[PDB]
């Protein structure tokens, strides 16, 4: 179990991650650095050791069953995610802990909010596809429900979320409802209602088929 | 040090798929060697590791009597033969070296190669319009397989620009969306390389 599941800190500040393993055995507990699309890069090796290459503020121990990694100051470079991991010697296998994201503190920001009707093109196709965008929001915690005609919609909206942009460090957020075009073409009010810290009460965006 | 990979591949479910794993720069049977997979949008997710000499394996509950991981020392290669492909082992498959001076952590890992499992065929997206301060993209809709790319503008149009990652749909087919806010012309340039399929959308 890693925890907590995200850090925001800034630049320069501390960064303490926790890991609870199986046994204490020292020996047996690793951690590595993971950034988007590249593959894992060792840290710490049996728990208080650092691997070829890694820098001094990198420093690890293990206090029972508990297992901290701390980044003593954070670098630019720092802002990836982090895995404890266990093995002994039989049975052989590996366990990994479920990674905690070290992300970019920054100021809170609500997010400005669109949303789309299902373009004549695609109804045309067949289907029909209700878009809702939250953009430059922080932080990443947002809640977004789909309404028809005051119908709570569940199960049938897919929402995919950019990383942290590089220039202002937000995020922007993309829901799409997909509705057969039949039942599209049955109701009348399509509302993607947000709710998210930097709004201090819920905002919806809606039209009118 | 190092491990090269390969034998990734885009595969129906129950077809088979061989990985390969080259190592160079320390001598391979010195150490033992393990398969890692990272399912997408999850995290580091051991499979299965080999001896040393070869001679026993072990496996991860979820891919037993399916998997069978094996080396050629002579040729510095491990290998992970995958049969019985299901939709749920697409991940991406990194080979992990034992460490040197502990070998219960993985010091070296390879650059990892992509196994795609899916009962849906190859097939190229279509590019539907989304429409002071205002917001317009393009719908990229029921692609496979992954990945499409995305401009606005032949690339000239970047500020502002937001494009999501794809989305696996129920149909099994993805989905993407790309967005723009502007504050004249706009083009969303798709390339879906596996279907060769380029469409210029202008919203
Ligand atoms: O190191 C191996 C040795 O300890 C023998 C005899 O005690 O036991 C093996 O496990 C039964 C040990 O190897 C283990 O499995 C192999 C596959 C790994 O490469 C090793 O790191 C170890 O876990």
């Known amino acids: 179990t890693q925890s907590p599941a995200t850090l925001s800190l800034s630049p320069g500040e501390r960064a303490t991650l926790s890991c609870r393993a199986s046994?204490?055995?020292?020996?047996?507990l690793a951690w590595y650095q993971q950034k988007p699309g590249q593959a894992p890069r060792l840290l710490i090796y049996?728990?208080?050791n650092r691997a070829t290459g890694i820098p001094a503020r990198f420093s690890g121990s293990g206090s029972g069953t508990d297992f901290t990694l701390t980044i003593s100051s954070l670098e630019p470079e720092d802002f990836a995610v982090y895995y404890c991991?266990?093995?002994?010697?039989?049975?052989?296998?590996?366990?990994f802990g479920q990674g905690t994201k070290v992300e970019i503190k920054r100021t809170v920001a609500a997010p400005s909010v669109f949303i789309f009707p299902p373009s004549d093109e695609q109804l045309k196709s067949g289907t029909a596809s209700v878009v809702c965008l939250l953009n430059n929001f922080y932080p990443r915690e947002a809640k977004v429900q789909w309404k028809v005609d005051n119908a709570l919609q569940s199960g049938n909206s897919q929402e995919s979320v950019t990383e942290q942009d590089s220039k202002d460090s937000t995020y922007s957020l993309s829901s799409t409802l997909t509705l057969s075009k039949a039942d599209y073409e049955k109701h009348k009010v399509y509302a993607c209602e947000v709710t998210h810290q930097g709004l201090r009460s819920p905002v919806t965006k809606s039209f009118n088929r | 040090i190092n491990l090269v990979e390969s034998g990734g591949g885009v595969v129906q479910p129950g077809r088979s798929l061989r990985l390969s794993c080259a190592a160079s720069?320390?001598?391979?049977?010195?150490?033992?060697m393990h398969w890692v997979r990272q399912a997408p949008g999850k995290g580091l997710e051991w499979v299965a590791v080999?001896?040393?000499?070869?001679?026993?394996?072990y496996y991860a509950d979820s891919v037993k009597g399916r998997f069978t991981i094996s080396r050629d020392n002579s040729k510095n290669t491990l290998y992970l033969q995958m049969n019985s492909l299901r939709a749920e082992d697409t991940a991406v498959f990194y080979c992990?070296?034992?460490?040197?001076?502990?070998?219960?952590?993985?010091?070296?890992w390879g650059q990892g190669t992509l196994v795609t499992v899916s009962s849906a065929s190859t097939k190229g997206p279509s590019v539907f319009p989304l429409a002071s301060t205002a917001a317009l993209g393009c719908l990229v809709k029921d692609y496979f397989p992954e990945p499409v790319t995305v401009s606005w503008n032949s690339g000239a149009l970047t500020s502002g620009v937001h494009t999501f990652p794809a989305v696996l749909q129920s149909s099994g087919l993805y989905s993407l969306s790309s967005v723009v806010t502007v504050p004249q012309t706009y083009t969303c340039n798709v390339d879906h390389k596996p279907s060769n399929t380029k469409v210029d959308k202008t919203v």
């Open positions: 992990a070296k034992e460490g040197g001076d502990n070998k219960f952590s993985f010091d070296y």
């Open positions: 720069g320390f001598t391979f049977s010195r150490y033992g």
């Open positions: 080999v001896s040393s000499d070869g001679r026993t394996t």
């Open positions: 046994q204490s055995v020292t020996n047996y």
């Open positions: 049996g728990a208080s």
């Open positions: 991991q266990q093995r002994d010697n039989w049975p052989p296998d590996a366990t």
